[PDB]
Amino acid sequence: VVGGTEAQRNSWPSQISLQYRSGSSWAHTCGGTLIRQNWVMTAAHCVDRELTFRVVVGEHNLNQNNGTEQYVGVQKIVVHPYWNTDDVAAGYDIALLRLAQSVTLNSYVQLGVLPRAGTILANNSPCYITGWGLTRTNGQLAQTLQQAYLPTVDYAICSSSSYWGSTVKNSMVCAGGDGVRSGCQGDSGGPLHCLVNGQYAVHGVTSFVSRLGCNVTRKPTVFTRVSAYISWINNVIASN
Numbered sequence: 001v002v003g004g005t006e007a008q009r010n011s012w013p014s015q016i017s018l019q020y021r022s023g024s025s026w027a028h029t030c031g032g033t034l035i036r037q038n039w040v041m042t043a044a045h046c047v048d049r050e051l052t053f054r055v056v057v058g059e060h061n062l063n064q065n066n067g068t069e070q071y072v073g074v075q076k077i078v079v080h081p082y083w084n085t086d087d088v089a090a091g092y093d094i095a096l097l098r099l100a101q102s103v104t105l106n107s108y109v110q111l112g113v114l115p116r117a118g119t120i121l122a123n124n125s126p127c128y129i130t131g132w133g134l135t136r137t138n139g140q141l142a143q144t145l146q147q148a149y150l151p152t153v154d155y156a157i158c159s160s161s162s163y164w165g166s167t168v169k170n171s172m173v174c175a176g177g178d179g180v181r182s183g184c185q186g187d188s189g190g191p192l193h194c195l196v197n198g199q200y201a202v203h204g205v206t207s208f209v210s211r212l213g214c215n216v217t218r219k220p221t222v223f224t225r226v227s228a229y230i231s232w233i234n235n236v237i238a239s240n
C-alpha cells in the first residue's frame with residue numbers, strides 16, 4: 001500500500017498473508033481473505049507459479065511474533081476456469097484455496113463478509129485497501145499491516161479513455177487514482193473493504209495497477225468484483 005497508514009491490530013481480522021516457501025524460509029507474496037474457516041479467497045495470478053503456499057492468519061507484523069498468528073498450509077487450489085495468465089485485463093483474477101485445517105476464530109481471526117450477488121457500489125463509495133505490499137513504487141514491503149482510504153471509481157468513469165479505458169471491464173472494481181494512495185506489488189489478492197449499510201464487506205480482490213507505477217493520477221487500483229463471482233464461490237465450496 002502506497003501512502004497508507006498503519007492499521008490497528010484488530011481492525012481487519014479477515015486479512016491474511018499468503019506466503020511461499022523460499023529456500024529455507026517463507027516470504028509474503030500476496031494478500032487474501034478468509035471466507036471460510038478452511039477457505040481463503042485471493043487473486044488467481046497469486047498462485048500461477050507452482051510453489052508451496054501457506055496462509056498466515058492473525059498476522060500483524062510480518063517480521064515479528066504478534067502472539068496471534070496461525071499458520072496453515074494449502075491443501076487445494078481452485079482457480080477460476082476462465083483465468084488466463086497472459087490476459088489479466090480479461091478478468092477472472094480470482095482463486096479459492098482450501099486450507100489443510102480449520103483456523104480458530106477469534107478477535108484477530110474472522111470471516112470476511114461478502115456482498116450480495118450483482119452488487120454495484122455507487123461512485124465515490126467509502127472503501128479501504130489493506131495489505132503488506134510495497135509502500136512505494138519499486139520500494140519495499142511493509143512490515144506492518146497498512147491501510148488506505150480508497151473511494152471507488154464507477155465503471156463509466158474508470159472505463160473512460162482518460163482512465164483505464166477498455167483495459168477494465170464490468171467485472172472489476174476501481175478505487176483510488178488520486179496519485180497519492182494505492183495498492184502496490186504484494187497487495188494483490190487482498191481485500192477491498194467497503195462500508196455498506198453500516199457494515200464492512202469485501203467488494204473486491206486486488207488485481208492490478210499501471211505499468212507506469214502504483215500511484216498514478218487517473219489510474220485507480222483495479223480489483224476483481226467479488227459480487228460477480230458469488231455463484232461461482234458458493235459452487236466451489238459446496239463441491240470441494
Ligand SMILES: *C(=O)c1cc(N)ccc1[C@H](*)C(=O)OCCBr
Pocket residue numbers: 029030031043045046088185186187188189190206207208
Ligand atoms: C498481487 O497479487 C501481486 C503480488 C505480487 N507479489 C506480484 C504480482 C501481483 C499481481 C500483479 O499482477 O502484479 C504483477 C507484478 Br509487476
Ligand SMILES: [Ca+2]
Pocket residue numbers: 059060061062063064065066067069
Ligand atoms: Ca507476526
